[PDB]
Design a protein around this ligand. Structure first.
Ligand SMILES: CCCCCCCC/C=C/CCCCCCCC(=O)OC[C@H](O)CO
Ligand SMILES: CCCCCCCC/C=C\CCCCCCCC(=O)OC[C@H](O)CO
Ligand SMILES: CCCCCCCC/C=C\CCCCCCCC(=O)OC[C@H](O)CO
Ligand SMILES: OC[C@H]1O[C@H](O)[C@H](O)[C@@H](O)[C@@H]1O
Length: 470
């Protein structure tokens, strides 16, 4: 660190940014607990308007739309990240898009009194747009304001906000909290509250000093930001690194999404970036999490909701473990340990489910395998893919790269949700071997192809890719 310090100003800026992370986690998790209540809302709304009651097929299809349109919004929003952050700045983009959060939140909060299934769906779409933007904005901002020596640790706070968001959503989802037939619209509308808090705090957060110096050529203002954030007058090493990046950006053509795949020095890190997002989603994490309640039930958990909240707690604990290890073990090591551990547990899910009707003891192995799967997920594959894309690129290509990588993350999530039910229908317990196959494939990819980013400047990493390309 040298004379660099973790100041209250720095902790403030990072924590305020991760309110967006919290929003992504909350909106991801919140819809699941009130599924039956929301289906009753859809039924009653259709018949209140005079229609025939929907079949189970239509209810399932409208429920699935309500859930999945969030991912569609996220695909669009994440892909749009580059547009916003280069035009408005990183801090200013986070401020502006809270208009989407409050709007989507109000649509969801008002859909019941408006007796409108359309408003629920529109609300989920709009909050999806917002969350997709957040998943790119937050690790970018944190990556650009963090001291290099702590960039991974601070990057992991993005995922910590996400898993805290999921857990709070699960806890609120309880029937005696906000998950009642009465108040479920408030469960959804809750997302307006972190938006108001974040929006009030964001003006007092600095704009990215990298955006200021490199994109806007405001060296003096950037230097003063760093000096305050890092609690030291001496920031020459970092300013000169940014000036090197400014020279680079001035010497490279304006970056487009398509160019990322055409240029060898860009194609290596964008393929790494995309494959790392795939390793996160094609792990099956959201399928395992969503369907955990039913799997727990089938293995004999009498009160499955408590096991799923237990998973949410494990989810949080091991994100904190990752936080404390990622600068020591490095990104490569934690990502590989997580992928390998998940491959073991997903295989054990298949084996235990195949055996449990003959050997009941294997029921408990199944329950344990899901919990340990989540633990290994958060050791690396949860936190690292979101922030590592910021690390793999210099200032110029970073927004387009995070747009592409973030979109690939949301899109692969969408595909898992779309295809998993059919795959499970044909393969039964063997469906989890599909995730095992991906996990192993990406474990091999990570070992051979993913560079260690810990403690390295963006310019260091970029020069290394150019050297490999040459
Ligand atoms: C202007 C007044 C505003 C209205 C008042 C509303 C406050 C009540 C709702 C709070 C949402 C809770 C926000 C939770 C955000 C947590 C961020 C996070 O999870 O941080 C992870 C890690 O700590 C990163 O440092
Ligand atoms: C009504 C009787 C109770 C039965 C139900 C109790 C289970 C509720 C808690 C957690 C479920 C997991 C949700 C939190 C994690 C979300 C994982 C996820 O990926 O959710 C996406 C899914 O498509 C959704 O949108
Ligand atoms: C009707 C039978 C067809 C099957 C069901 C209909 C299709 C569902 C499609 C996608 C669901 C994806 C769930 C969306 C919520 C997950 C949000 C999330 O946490 O991830 C976002 C992104 O992946 C960053 O990680
Ligand atoms: O903790 C689970 C969450 O981890 C990561 O943030 C994923 O991007 C998200 O899809 C998942 O729901």
């Amino acid at each position: 660190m040298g004379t660099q310090k973790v100041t209250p100003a720095l902790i403030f800026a990072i924590t305020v940014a991760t309110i967006g992370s919290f929003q992504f986690g909350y909106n991801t998790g919140v819809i699941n607990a009130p599924e039956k209540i929301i289906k009753e809302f859809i039924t009653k709304t259709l018949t209140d308007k005079g229609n025939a009651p929907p079949s189970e097929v239509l209810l399932t299809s409208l429920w699935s739309l309500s859930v999945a349109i969030f991912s569609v919004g996220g695909m669009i929003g994440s892909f749009s990240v580059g547009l916003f952050v280069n035009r408005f700045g990183r801090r200013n983009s986070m401020l502006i898009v809270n208009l989407l959060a409050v709007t989507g939140g109000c649509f969801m909060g008002l859909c019941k009194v408006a007796k409108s299934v359309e408003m629920l769906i529109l609300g989920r779409l709009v909050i999806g747009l917002f969350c997709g933007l957040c998943t790119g904005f937050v690790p970018m901002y944190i990556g650009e304001i963090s001291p290099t020596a702590l960039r991974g640790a601070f990057g992991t706070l993005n995922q910590l906000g996400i898993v805290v968001g999921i857990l709070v959503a699960q806890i609120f989802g309880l029937e005696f909290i906000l998950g009642s037939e009465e108040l479920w619209p408030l469960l959804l509308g809750f997302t307006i509250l972190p938006a108001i808090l974040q929006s009030a705090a964001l003006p007092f957060c600095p704009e990215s000093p990298r955006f200021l110096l490199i994109n806007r050529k405001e060296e003096e203002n950037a230097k003063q930001i760093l000096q305050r954030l890092w609690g030291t007058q001496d920031v020459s090493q970092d300013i000169q690194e940014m000036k090197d990046e400014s020279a680079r950006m001035s010497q490279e053509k304006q970056v487009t999404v398509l160019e990322l795949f055409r240029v060898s020095s860009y194609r290596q890190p964008i393929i790494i970036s995309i494959v790392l997002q795939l390793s996160q989603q094609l792990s099956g994490i959201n399928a395992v999490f969503y369907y955990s309640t039913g799997i727990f039930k089938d293995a004999g958990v009498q009160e499955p909701i408590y096991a799923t909240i237990g998973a949410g707690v494990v989810n949080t604990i091991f994100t904190v473990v990752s936080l404390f290890l990622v600068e020591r073990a490095g990104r490569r090591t934690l990502h590989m340990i997580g992928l390998g551990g998940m491959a073991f547990c997903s295989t054990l899910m298949t084996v235990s489910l195949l055996l449990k009707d003959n050997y009941n003891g294997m029921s408990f192995v199944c329950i344990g395998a899901i919990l340990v799967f989540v633990a290994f997920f958060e050791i690396g594959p949860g936190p690292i893919p979101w922030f590592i894309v910021a690390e793999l690129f210099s200032q110029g290509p970073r927004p387009a790269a995070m747009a592409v990588a973030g979109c690939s993350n949301w899109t692969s999530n969408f595909l898992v949700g779309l295809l998993f039910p059919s795959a499970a229908h044909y393969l039964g317990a063997y469906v989890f071997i599909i995730f095992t196959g991906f996990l192993i494939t990406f474990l091999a990819f990570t070992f051979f192809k993913v560079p260690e980013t810990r403690g390295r400047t963006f310019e260091d990493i970029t020069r290394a890719f150019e050297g490999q390309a040459h």
